[PDB]
Design a protein around this nucleic acid. Structure first.
Ligand SMILES: [Zn+2]
Ligand SMILES: [Zn+2]
Lengths: 113, 114
DNA sequence: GCTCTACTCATCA
DNA sequence: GTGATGACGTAGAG
């Protein structure tokens, strides 16, 4: 029986993380480790990691799950990305957490001026 | 036989203006009235009339002729629009020739700022 | 804590 | 006198 890669105990994987994101992780372990497994909206990815629309629209770069827009089914679909992929791309791009914060620090300044 | 709408004499229409732009205009009248019949590139339409990419990209709005990009076949194709259509849309948008010139006047100022 | 892009120019294509 | 768009961010519509 294949095991969850975090606990090595559960054998029933979370259907979203497994099927959409290709992660053999159980639902419990996913709540226990949001730092790796939380789902982020497109908008949160841009706020948190400073990724651009072109990066987040690239079908070849991230797995994504889509849902109806909660404000209205007639609006553009909500797009959910998994934190570990988004973060790994953001660290490659800005140079680790070290660099990402530099860019946070940067944007906060011009925020005033 | 049907006659050119500018001269009322010629019977063979310019192939581009007829087939692509639906104007029964002979080639000679087209050279004689560029103020209506000259063909403008996409970039020229933006420069001259302050039309935006969404307006010029709207397939339902203007007739267009496409050619190979003269800088390179591998670049984005060149797009040619006929001045009467582009001008008539621009006068509607900015308010005749008059409003258009105000927008010229306006844009030269912010240019001086920088 | 929703998404998409229009809102004047280098650069690349 | 070539075309398309991303680039300090973001309102507004959707
Ligand atoms: Zn587990
Ligand atoms: Zn004629």
């Amino acid at each position: 029986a294949p095991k969850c890669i975090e606990c090595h105990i559960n054998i029933e994987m979370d259907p979203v993380l497994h099927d959409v994101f290709k992660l053999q992780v159980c639902k419990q372990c996913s709540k226990e480790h949001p730092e790796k497994y939380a789902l982020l909206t497109k908008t949160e990815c841009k706020e948190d990691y400073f990724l651009t629309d072109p990066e987040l629209n690239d079908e070849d770069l991230f797995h994504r799950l889509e849902k109806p827009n909660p404000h209205s089914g007639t609006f553009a679909r909500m797009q959910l990305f998994v934190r570990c992929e988004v973060e790994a791309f953001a660290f490659k791009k800005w140079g680790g957490e070290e660099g990402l914060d530099e860019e946070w620090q940067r944007r906060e300044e011009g925020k005033a001026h």
